[PDB]
Design a protein around this ligand. Structure first.
Ligand SMILES: C[C@@H]1O[C@@H](O)[C@H](O)[C@H](O)[C@H]1O
Lengths: 203, 212
C-alpha cells in the first residue's frame, strides 16, 4: 500500500544544480516528517536533511547547509530536494525516507533511490583492450558515465566469468575488467550513454 | 551522535545464529532501529524501538538493548539474510539521524587459495599511449587478500586500484583484480613486472611476473 517513488537524479558538472522528487502514496503524507538520506559509492548510509510534516521546519547535515533546500508540497504528496552548487563529493545515491508510523525515530518506508553524479568529466565511450586452467578477458577502459555491460560470446558463455565492479580512475573516467577462466572468445561490450557497442574477440 | 557497530564482518553458514551489536556514545533517549540492505537496493526497516519487528519481517529477526547497548539477532540464518545491516538513531531535536557504519554478514565456506594470473598491457593499448598491468586473483576464500606490485623490485604505492566481485552465487568465493597504471614512457623504462599475492590458502606468497 505505501510507496515512495523518486526521480530527478542525473549526471551533472560541479557548480550546476539538480532537483530531486519523491512522490508518496498509500498513506496520509501531510502527517509525517520526511527525510533525504544518501549513500556515496562504497559508503554507508548518511543522513542529509529533514522537513517536518507541515513543511515549516527544516534541518540539514552540515555538509549541505546553504547549498541544498528540502521542501514538500502536501497538495501533491511530494518531497523535494533542491541541490545547488553541486560538488564531486556529493556524488551518491539519494533516498527519501518516511518517519515511522509506529515509531517516528525510525524510517519505515524508503524510495528506491535516485543517482546523483557530479563530475567535470564528459560522456565518452570505452576503449576495449584484450587481456591475454587459463584466464583471459577484456579491459573496458576510460568510459563515462556508468554503466557498461559485458557478456561473453553473445551470452552463450557464462560459466567461469567474472565481471568486476567498475573503478573510478583519477582521470574521472571509469574502468573495469571482465575475465573468464577456461574455441573463440569475444566480449560483447555496450555503453549506452555513448551509443557504443563493441564485440572484441580476444586472441 | 556516533553509533559504532561490531563486528565489521560476520562469516556464518545458513542456520547459524548471527548477533550484531551497536553501541552509542551516550544514552539514546529513543531506542534504536535496524535496517537490512542488499547491494543496489534501498535499505529495509527490520526493527524499531530496539525490539519491535517491522511489517513483514520474519520471526527469526529480533533485537534488544537499552541505554547505550543494542543488538540485533538472527536466530537461524536463511540464504537471503546475507547482506549488510545498519543500526540507526534519531532524537526529537535536533532531528538529524545517525547511522552505524554497518555490519556485513557473509557466507562461511572452506578455505580456497586464489589462482593468480598477470596480464601485460596489450600492444593495442600501448599505441594508445597508456599502460595497464592487470593482476587477477580468482575464486578465493576468505576475502582478505594482499596484492603487492613491484616494478624492477620497486614497491608500487598509490598507482593501482582493485575491484572485488560479490561472493559467488554458486561456490561462495571472491575474485579480485588489481590494475597498475603507468605512463607508456615509464612502462618502457622497466623490465620486470610482478604481482605478489598473500592469502590464507597459500602457505607462502605467490608471485606472477613477466619480462617486458
Ligand atoms: C522536523 C521535525 O522535528 C521534530 O518535530 C521531530 O523530530 C519530527 O519527527 C521532525 O519531522
Amino acid at each position: 500500500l505505501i510507496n515512495l517513488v523518486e526521480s530527478g537524479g542525473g549526471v551533472v558538472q560541479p557548480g550546476r544544480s539538480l532537483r530531486l522528487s519523491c512522490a508518496a502514496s498509500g498513506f496520509t503524507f501531510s502527517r509525517y516528517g520526511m527525510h533525504w538520506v544518501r549513500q556515496a559509492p562504497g559508503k554507508g548510509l548518511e543522513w542529509v536533511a529533514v522537513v517536518s510534516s507541515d513543511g515549516r521546519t527544516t534541518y540539514y547535515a552540515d555538509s549541505v547547509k546553504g547549498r541544498f533546500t528540502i521542501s514538500r508540497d502536501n497538495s501533491k504528496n511530494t518531497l523535494y530536494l533542491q541541490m545547488n552548487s553541486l560538488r564531486a563529493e556529493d556524488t551518491a545515491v539519494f533516498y527519501c525516507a518516511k518517519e515511522g508510523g509506529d515509531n517516528k525515530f525510525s524510517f519505515d518506508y524508503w524510495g528506491q533511490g535516485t543517482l546523483v553524479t557530479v563530475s567535470s568529466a564528459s560522456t565518452k565511450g570505452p576503449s576495449v583492450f584484450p587481456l591475454a586452467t587459463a584466464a583471459l578477458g577484456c579491459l573496458v577502459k576510460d568510459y563515462f558515465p556508468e554503466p557498461v555491460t559485458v557478456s561473453w560470446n553473445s551470452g552463450a558463455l557464462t560459466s567461469g566469468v567474472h565481471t568486476f565492479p567498475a573503478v573510478l580512475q583519477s582521470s574521472g573516467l571509469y574502468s573495469l575488467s571482465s575475465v573468464v577462466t577456461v574455441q573463440t572468445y569475444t566480449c560483447n561490450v555496450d555503453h549506452k550513454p555513448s551509443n557504443t557497442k563493441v564485440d572484441k574477440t580476444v586472441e | 551522535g556516533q553509533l559504532t557497530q561490531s563486528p565489521a564482518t560476520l562469516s556464518l553458514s545458513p542456520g547459524e545464529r548471527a548477533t550484531l551489536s551497536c553501541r552509542a556514545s551516550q544514552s539514546v533517549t529513543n531506542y534504536l532501529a535496524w535496517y537490512q540492505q542488499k547491494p543496489g537496493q534501498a535499505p529495509r526497516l527490520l526493527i524499531y524501538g530496539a525490539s519491535n519487528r517491522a511489517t513483514g519481517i520474519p520471526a527469526r529477526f529480533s533485537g534488544s538493548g537499552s541505554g547505550t547497548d543494542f543488538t540485533l539477532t538472527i536466530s537461524s540464518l536463511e540464504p537471503e539474510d546475507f547482506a549488510v545491516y545498519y543500526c540507526q538513531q534519531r532524537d526529537n531535536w535536533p532531528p538529524d539521524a545517525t547511522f552505524g557504519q554497518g555490519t556485513k554478514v557473509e557466507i562461511k565456506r572452506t578455505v580456497a587459495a586464489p589462482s593468480v594470473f598477470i596480464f601485460p598491457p596489450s600492444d593495442e593499448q600501448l599505441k594508445s599511449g597508456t599502460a595497464s598491468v592487470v593482476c587477477l586473483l580468482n575464486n578465493f576464500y576468505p576475502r582478505e587478500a594482499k596484492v603487492q606490485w613491484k616494478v624492477d623490485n620497486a614497491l608500487q604505492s598509490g598507482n593501482s586500484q582493485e575491484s572485488v566481485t560479490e561472493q559467488d552465487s554458486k561456490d561462495s568465493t571472491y575474485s579480485l583484480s588489481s590494475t597498475l597504471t603507468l605512463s607508456k614512457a615509464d612502462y618502457e623504462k622497466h623490465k620486470v613486472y610482478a604481482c605478489e599475492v598473500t592469502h590464507q590458502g597459500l602457505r607462502s606468497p605467490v608471485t606472477k611476473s613477466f619480462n617486458r
